[PDB]
Amino acid sequence: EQGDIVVALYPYDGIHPDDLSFKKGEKMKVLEEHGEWWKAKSLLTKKEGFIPSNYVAKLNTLE
């Protein structure tokens, strides 16, 4: 859901300006879920952009 903290499982290089580029282990805040791609904010760079949702996992997976 919106505001959840996620961690990158694999790195990803954005191909377009609206994408975030991240490394494995990078922490991001999910802003909006839009199917396969989510809008997120890198907690390291504070930059926002779309990320492939299959490349991240919730830091909280139990609840």
Curated annotation (Swiss-Prot):
It is found in: Cell membrane; Nucleus; Cytoplasm; Cytoplasm, Perinuclear region. Signal peptide: none annotated. Ubiquitinated by CBL, leading to its degradation. Ubiquitination is SH3-dependent. Residues 1-61 form the SH3 domain. It comes from the Eukaryota. Detected in monocytes (at protein level). Detected in placenta, and in fetal brain, lung, liver and kidney. Widely expressed in a variety of organs, tissues, and cell types such as epidermoid, hematopoietic, and neuronal cells. Expressed in primary neuroblastoma tumors. It is linked to Autoinflammatory disease, systemic, with vasculitis: An autosomal dominant disorder characterized by systemic autoinflammation manifesting in the first hours of life with diffuse purpuric skin lesions, fever, hepatosplenomegaly, and increased C-reactive protein. Additional clinical features include periorbital edema, conjunctivitis, urticaria, atopic dermatitis, abdominal pain, and arthralgia. Laboratory studies may show leukocytosis, thrombocytopenia, and autoantibodies. Constitutively phosphorylated and activated in cells from a number of chronic myelogenous leukemia (CML) and acute myeloid leukemia (AML) patients. Mediates phosphorylation of the BCR-ABL fusion protein. Abnormally elevated expression levels or activation of LYN signaling may play a role in survival and proliferation of some types of cancer cells. The protein kinase domain plays an important role in its localization in the cell membrane. Non-receptor tyrosine-protein kinase that transmits signals from cell surface receptors and plays an important role in the regulation of innate and adaptive immune responses, hematopoiesis, responses to growth factors and cytokines, integrin signaling, but also responses to DNA damage and genotoxic agents. Functions primarily as negative regulator, but can also function as activator, depending on the context. Required for the initiation of the B-cell response, but also for its down-regulation and termination. Interacts with TEC. Interacts (via SH2 domain) with FLT3 (tyrosine phosphorylated). Interacts with LIME1 and with CD79A upon activation of the B-cell antigen receptor. Interacts with the B-cell receptor complex. Interacts with phosphorylated THEMIS2. Interacts with EPOR. Interacts with MS4A2/FCER1B. Interaction (via the SH2 and SH3 domains) with MUC1 is stimulated by IL7 and the subsequent phosphorylation increases the binding between MUC1 and CTNNB1/beta-catenin. Interacts with ADAM15. Interacts with NDFIP2 and more weakly with NDFIP1. Interacts with FASLG. Interacts with KIT. Belongs to the protein kinase superfamily. Tyr protein kinase family. SRC subfamily. This is Tyrosine-protein kinase Lyn. It comes from Homo sapiens (Human). The lineage of its organism: Eukaryota, Metazoa, Chordata, Craniata, Vertebrata. The gene is LYN. The chain holds residues 63 to 125 of 512 of the full protein.
